[PDB]
Design a protein around this ligand. Structure first.
Ligand SMILES: C[C@@H](Oc1ccc2[nH]nc(-c3ccc(N4CC5(C4)CN(S(C)(=O)=O)C5)nc3)c2c1)c1c(Cl)cncc1Cl
Length: 276
Protein backbone atom coordinates (compact mmCIF):
# COMPACT_ATOMS: atom_id res chain seq x y z
CA UNK A 1 0.00 0.00 0.00
CA UNK A 2 1.64 3.19 -1.29
CA UNK A 3 2.30 6.57 0.35
CA UNK A 4 -0.78 8.72 0.02
CA UNK A 5 0.85 11.84 -1.48
CA UNK A 6 4.31 11.84 -3.08
CA UNK A 7 5.67 14.52 -5.42
CA UNK A 8 5.09 14.10 -9.14
CA UNK A 9 8.11 12.42 -10.73
CA UNK A 10 11.13 14.68 -11.52
CA UNK A 11 12.27 14.91 -15.13
CA UNK A 12 15.70 13.70 -16.18
CA UNK A 13 16.13 15.98 -19.23
CA UNK A 14 18.77 13.92 -21.07
CA UNK A 15 16.43 10.89 -21.18
CA UNK A 16 13.10 12.71 -21.55
CA UNK A 17 11.18 12.03 -24.76
CA UNK A 18 8.51 14.39 -26.04
CA UNK A 19 5.09 12.67 -25.91
CA UNK A 20 4.46 13.92 -29.46
CA UNK A 21 7.15 11.47 -30.60
CA UNK A 22 5.59 8.40 -28.98
CA UNK A 23 2.66 6.38 -30.38
CA UNK A 24 1.57 3.36 -28.32
CA UNK A 25 0.63 0.08 -30.02
CA UNK A 26 -0.15 -3.59 -29.44
CA UNK A 27 0.51 -5.21 -26.01
CA UNK A 28 3.48 -7.58 -26.05
CA UNK A 29 3.30 -9.15 -22.58
CA UNK A 30 3.82 -8.83 -18.84
CA UNK A 31 7.08 -9.30 -16.92
CA UNK A 32 7.77 -9.05 -13.18
CA UNK A 33 6.72 -5.39 -12.87
CA UNK A 34 4.20 -3.70 -15.17
CA UNK A 35 3.50 -4.62 -18.79
CA UNK A 36 5.28 -4.05 -22.09
CA UNK A 37 3.66 -2.69 -25.25
CA UNK A 38 4.92 -2.12 -28.78
CA UNK A 39 5.32 1.54 -29.78
CA UNK A 40 6.84 3.94 -32.31
CA UNK A 41 9.19 6.73 -31.27
CA UNK A 42 10.15 9.37 -33.86
CA UNK A 43 13.76 10.58 -33.63
CA UNK A 44 15.30 7.72 -31.60
CA UNK A 45 17.62 6.98 -34.55
CA UNK A 46 20.03 9.92 -34.47
CA UNK A 47 21.08 9.28 -38.09
CA UNK A 48 17.46 9.15 -39.35
CA UNK A 49 15.82 11.91 -37.34
CA UNK A 50 12.36 11.78 -38.95
CA UNK A 51 12.04 7.96 -38.92
CA UNK A 52 9.59 6.36 -36.43
CA UNK A 53 11.59 3.59 -34.75
CA UNK A 54 9.75 0.65 -33.23
CA UNK A 55 10.46 0.42 -29.50
CA UNK A 56 9.12 -1.38 -26.44
CA UNK A 57 7.40 0.67 -23.73
CA UNK A 58 7.26 -0.45 -20.09
CA UNK A 59 4.23 0.95 -18.29
CA UNK A 60 1.83 0.11 -15.45
CA UNK A 61 -0.58 -2.81 -15.72
CA UNK A 62 -4.25 -1.99 -16.26
CA UNK A 63 -5.10 -2.87 -12.63
CA UNK A 64 -2.06 -1.19 -11.03
CA UNK A 65 -1.91 1.18 -8.08
CA UNK A 66 1.03 3.56 -7.68
CA UNK A 67 2.79 0.91 -5.58
CA UNK A 68 3.81 -0.53 -8.96
CA UNK A 69 5.06 2.90 -10.01
CA UNK A 70 8.07 2.85 -7.66
CA UNK A 71 9.09 -0.52 -9.16
CA UNK A 72 8.93 0.74 -12.74
CA UNK A 73 10.93 3.83 -11.71
CA UNK A 74 13.53 1.78 -9.81
CA UNK A 75 13.98 -0.37 -12.93
CA UNK A 76 14.53 2.65 -15.17
CA UNK A 77 17.00 4.10 -12.67
CA UNK A 78 18.90 0.79 -12.46
CA UNK A 79 19.15 0.68 -16.26
CA UNK A 80 20.66 4.19 -16.19
CA UNK A 81 23.20 3.18 -13.51
CA UNK A 82 24.14 -0.04 -15.33
CA UNK A 83 24.69 1.72 -18.66
CA UNK A 84 24.71 0.53 -22.27
CA UNK A 85 25.89 -2.78 -23.72
CA UNK A 86 25.23 -4.57 -27.02
CA UNK A 87 23.83 -7.73 -25.44
CA UNK A 88 21.29 -6.22 -23.05
CA UNK A 89 17.92 -4.53 -23.55
CA UNK A 90 18.95 -0.87 -23.24
CA UNK A 91 16.96 2.14 -22.04
CA UNK A 92 16.17 4.41 -24.99
CA UNK A 93 14.22 7.15 -23.21
CA UNK A 94 11.18 7.95 -21.05
CA UNK A 95 8.00 10.03 -20.82
CA UNK A 96 7.83 11.15 -17.16
CA UNK A 97 6.07 14.53 -17.41
CA UNK A 98 2.43 15.42 -18.07
CA UNK A 99 1.04 11.88 -18.22
CA UNK A 100 1.69 8.18 -17.46
CA UNK A 101 5.23 6.94 -16.92
CA UNK A 102 6.47 5.34 -20.15
CA UNK A 103 9.91 3.69 -20.17
CA UNK A 104 11.27 3.07 -23.68
CA UNK A 105 13.65 0.15 -24.17
CA UNK A 106 15.05 -1.64 -27.23
CA UNK A 107 12.65 -3.70 -29.35
CA UNK A 108 13.51 -7.32 -30.20
CA UNK A 109 11.62 -8.26 -33.35
CA UNK A 110 12.17 -12.03 -33.18
CA UNK A 111 10.92 -12.49 -29.60
CA UNK A 112 12.76 -14.40 -26.87
CA UNK A 113 15.50 -16.97 -27.46
CA UNK A 114 13.29 -19.91 -26.44
CA UNK A 115 10.62 -19.15 -29.05
CA UNK A 116 13.30 -18.06 -31.56
CA UNK A 117 14.93 -21.50 -31.41
CA UNK A 118 11.70 -23.51 -31.12
CA UNK A 119 10.30 -21.78 -34.23
CA UNK A 120 13.44 -22.58 -36.25
CA UNK A 121 13.68 -26.29 -35.36
CA UNK A 122 13.79 -28.81 -38.28
CA UNK A 123 10.07 -29.92 -38.06
CA UNK A 124 7.05 -27.79 -39.04
CA UNK A 125 5.61 -26.61 -42.37
CA UNK A 126 18.44 -23.28 -41.33
CA UNK A 127 19.82 -23.17 -37.78
CA UNK A 128 23.46 -24.28 -37.51
CA UNK A 129 25.65 -25.42 -34.62
CA UNK A 130 27.74 -22.23 -34.87
CA UNK A 131 24.52 -20.20 -34.48
CA UNK A 132 23.80 -21.97 -31.19
CA UNK A 133 27.31 -21.28 -29.91
CA UNK A 134 27.01 -17.67 -31.10
CA UNK A 135 23.81 -17.32 -29.05
CA UNK A 136 25.50 -18.70 -25.93
CA UNK A 137 28.57 -16.51 -26.40
CA UNK A 138 26.43 -13.39 -26.81
CA UNK A 139 24.39 -14.15 -23.67
CA UNK A 140 27.66 -14.70 -21.77
CA UNK A 141 28.99 -11.31 -22.89
CA UNK A 142 25.77 -9.68 -21.68
CA UNK A 143 26.08 -11.34 -18.26
CA UNK A 144 29.81 -10.55 -18.04
CA UNK A 145 28.87 -6.87 -18.50
CA UNK A 146 25.99 -6.97 -16.00
CA UNK A 147 28.16 -8.78 -13.42
CA UNK A 148 30.84 -6.11 -13.97
CA UNK A 149 28.18 -3.49 -13.04
CA UNK A 150 27.32 -5.34 -9.79
CA UNK A 151 24.05 -6.61 -11.32
CA UNK A 152 22.50 -9.98 -10.44
CA UNK A 153 19.69 -11.09 -12.76
CA UNK A 154 18.05 -13.68 -10.45
CA UNK A 155 15.97 -15.18 -13.30
CA UNK A 156 18.36 -15.78 -16.20
CA UNK A 157 16.66 -18.00 -18.80
CA UNK A 158 16.10 -18.27 -22.57
CA UNK A 159 12.66 -16.69 -22.06
CA UNK A 160 14.46 -13.60 -20.67
CA UNK A 161 16.90 -13.30 -23.57
CA UNK A 162 15.51 -11.40 -26.58
CA UNK A 163 16.52 -11.62 -30.25
CA UNK A 164 16.60 -8.52 -32.49
CA UNK A 165 15.96 -8.29 -36.24
CA UNK A 166 19.76 -8.57 -36.67
CA UNK A 167 19.90 -11.74 -34.51
CA UNK A 168 21.51 -9.97 -31.56
CA UNK A 169 21.00 -11.62 -28.16
CA UNK A 170 19.80 -9.10 -25.55
CA UNK A 171 19.26 -9.92 -21.87
CA UNK A 172 15.97 -8.53 -20.56
CA UNK A 173 14.58 -7.62 -17.12
CA UNK A 174 18.00 -7.31 -15.45
CA UNK A 175 16.65 -4.36 -13.44
CA UNK A 176 14.31 -5.37 -10.58
CA UNK A 177 8.44 -22.88 -13.62
CA UNK A 178 11.41 -20.56 -12.71
CA UNK A 179 12.54 -23.07 -10.07
CA UNK A 180 14.27 -25.11 -12.79
CA UNK A 181 16.79 -22.29 -13.35
CA UNK A 182 17.50 -21.64 -9.66
CA UNK A 183 20.79 -22.68 -8.11
CA UNK A 184 20.42 -24.90 -4.99
CA UNK A 185 21.69 -22.15 -2.68
CA UNK A 186 19.13 -19.74 -4.18
CA UNK A 187 16.35 -22.33 -4.11
CA UNK A 188 17.00 -23.76 -0.63
CA UNK A 189 18.78 -20.89 1.15
CA UNK A 190 17.43 -17.80 -0.71
CA UNK A 191 21.05 -16.85 -1.55
CA UNK A 192 21.61 -14.94 -4.81
CA UNK A 193 25.05 -14.17 -6.25
CA UNK A 194 26.68 -13.87 -9.67
CA UNK A 195 27.56 -17.55 -9.15
CA UNK A 196 23.85 -18.42 -8.86
CA UNK A 197 23.35 -16.68 -12.22
CA UNK A 198 26.07 -18.94 -13.64
CA UNK A 199 24.02 -21.99 -12.65
CA UNK A 200 21.06 -20.42 -14.42
CA UNK A 201 23.36 -19.80 -17.40
CA UNK A 202 24.22 -23.51 -17.41
CA UNK A 203 20.50 -24.34 -17.70
CA UNK A 204 20.29 -21.68 -20.42
CA UNK A 205 23.03 -23.47 -22.40
CA UNK A 206 20.93 -26.63 -22.15
CA UNK A 207 17.94 -24.68 -23.51
CA UNK A 208 20.05 -23.42 -26.40
CA UNK A 209 21.36 -26.85 -27.38
CA UNK A 210 17.91 -28.49 -27.15
CA UNK A 211 16.71 -25.71 -29.47
CA UNK A 212 14.53 -24.15 -26.76
CA UNK A 213 13.77 -27.35 -24.82
CA UNK A 214 12.24 -27.11 -21.35
CA UNK A 215 14.71 -28.36 -18.68
CA UNK A 216 14.19 -31.44 -16.50
CA UNK A 217 11.41 -32.59 -18.90
CA UNK A 218 8.74 -34.70 -17.18
CA UNK A 219 10.27 -34.14 -13.72
CA UNK A 220 7.94 -32.46 -11.14
CA UNK A 221 9.48 -29.88 -8.83
CA UNK A 222 9.24 -32.10 -5.72
CA UNK A 223 11.40 -34.71 -7.48
CA UNK A 224 13.73 -31.93 -8.67
CA UNK A 225 14.49 -30.85 -5.09
CA UNK A 226 15.44 -34.43 -4.22
CA UNK A 227 17.54 -35.18 -7.31
CA UNK A 228 19.50 -31.91 -7.08
CA UNK A 229 20.41 -32.78 -3.48
CA UNK A 230 21.37 -36.28 -4.67
CA UNK A 231 23.74 -34.51 -7.08
CA UNK A 232 22.00 -35.49 -10.35
CA UNK A 233 22.13 -33.22 -13.41
CA UNK A 234 20.65 -33.10 -16.91
CA UNK A 235 22.30 -35.31 -19.55
CA UNK A 236 24.12 -33.93 -22.62
CA UNK A 237 21.70 -32.64 -25.33
CA UNK A 238 21.82 -34.24 -28.78
CA UNK A 239 23.34 -31.16 -30.45
CA UNK A 240 25.97 -30.66 -27.72
CA UNK A 241 29.68 -31.53 -27.91
CA UNK A 242 31.68 -32.95 -25.00
CA UNK A 243 33.50 -29.64 -24.43
CA UNK A 244 30.24 -27.66 -24.26
CA UNK A 245 28.74 -30.28 -21.93
CA UNK A 246 31.72 -29.87 -19.58
CA UNK A 247 30.96 -26.13 -19.46
CA UNK A 248 27.36 -26.87 -18.45
CA UNK A 249 28.57 -29.26 -15.75
CA UNK A 250 31.04 -26.68 -14.41
CA UNK A 251 28.10 -24.25 -14.17
CA UNK A 252 26.28 -26.87 -12.07
CA UNK A 253 28.96 -27.51 -9.43
CA UNK A 254 27.17 -27.59 -6.08
CA UNK A 255 29.90 -25.35 -4.63
CA UNK A 256 29.34 -21.84 -6.15
CA UNK A 257 33.02 -20.82 -6.15
CA UNK A 258 33.86 -23.84 -8.32
CA UNK A 259 31.44 -22.60 -10.97
CA UNK A 260 33.25 -20.44 -13.59
CA UNK A 261 32.77 -16.67 -13.74
CA UNK A 262 30.98 -15.15 -16.73
CA UNK A 263 34.41 -13.78 -17.73
CA UNK A 264 35.64 -17.39 -17.92
CA UNK A 265 32.49 -18.48 -19.76
CA UNK A 266 32.95 -15.75 -22.38
CA UNK A 267 36.51 -16.98 -22.96
CA UNK A 268 35.35 -20.61 -23.06
CA UNK A 269 32.55 -19.91 -25.56
CA UNK A 270 34.94 -17.76 -27.64
CA UNK A 271 37.26 -20.75 -28.12
CA UNK A 272 34.36 -23.00 -29.13
CA UNK A 273 33.06 -20.28 -31.48
CA UNK A 274 36.40 -19.65 -33.16
CA UNK A 275 37.43 -23.25 -33.96
CA UNK A 276 33.94 -23.84 -35.41
C1 LIG B 1 7.31 -9.25 -20.83
C2 LIG B 1 7.94 -9.01 -22.19
O1 LIG B 1 8.92 -7.98 -21.95
C3 LIG B 1 9.60 -7.42 -23.00
C4 LIG B 1 10.57 -6.48 -22.60
C5 LIG B 1 11.34 -5.82 -23.53
C6 LIG B 1 11.14 -6.11 -24.88
N1 LIG B 1 11.73 -5.65 -26.01
N2 LIG B 1 11.21 -6.23 -27.11
C7 LIG B 1 10.27 -7.08 -26.72
C8 LIG B 1 9.52 -7.86 -27.72
C9 LIG B 1 9.29 -7.38 -29.00
C10 LIG B 1 8.57 -8.13 -29.90
C11 LIG B 1 8.06 -9.36 -29.50
N3 LIG B 1 7.32 -10.17 -30.39
C12 LIG B 1 7.19 -10.06 -31.85
C13 LIG B 1 7.03 -11.60 -31.89
C14 LIG B 1 7.16 -11.64 -30.34
C15 LIG B 1 5.79 -12.20 -32.59
N4 LIG B 1 6.72 -13.08 -33.37
S1 LIG B 1 6.62 -13.44 -34.97
C16 LIG B 1 5.17 -12.81 -35.75
O2 LIG B 1 7.74 -12.80 -35.60
O3 LIG B 1 6.51 -14.86 -35.04
C17 LIG B 1 7.95 -12.51 -32.73
N5 LIG B 1 8.26 -9.84 -28.27
C18 LIG B 1 8.98 -9.10 -27.39
C19 LIG B 1 10.18 -7.05 -25.29
C20 LIG B 1 9.39 -7.71 -24.34
C21 LIG B 1 8.52 -10.29 -22.76
C22 LIG B 1 7.87 -10.93 -23.81
CL1 LIG B 1 6.40 -10.29 -24.47
C23 LIG B 1 8.40 -12.09 -24.34
N6 LIG B 1 9.51 -12.65 -23.88
C24 LIG B 1 10.15 -12.04 -22.88
C25 LIG B 1 9.69 -10.88 -22.29
CL2 LIG B 1 10.60 -10.19 -20.98
Amino acid sequence: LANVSELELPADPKWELSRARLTLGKPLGEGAFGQVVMAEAIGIDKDRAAKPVTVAVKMLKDDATDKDLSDLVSEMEMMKMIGKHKNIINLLGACTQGGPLYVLVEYAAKGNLREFLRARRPPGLQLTFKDLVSCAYQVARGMEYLASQKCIHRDLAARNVLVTEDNVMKIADFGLLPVKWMAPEALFDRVYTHQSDVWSFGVLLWEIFTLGGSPYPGIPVEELFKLLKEGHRMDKPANCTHDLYMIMRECWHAAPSQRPTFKQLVEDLDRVLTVT
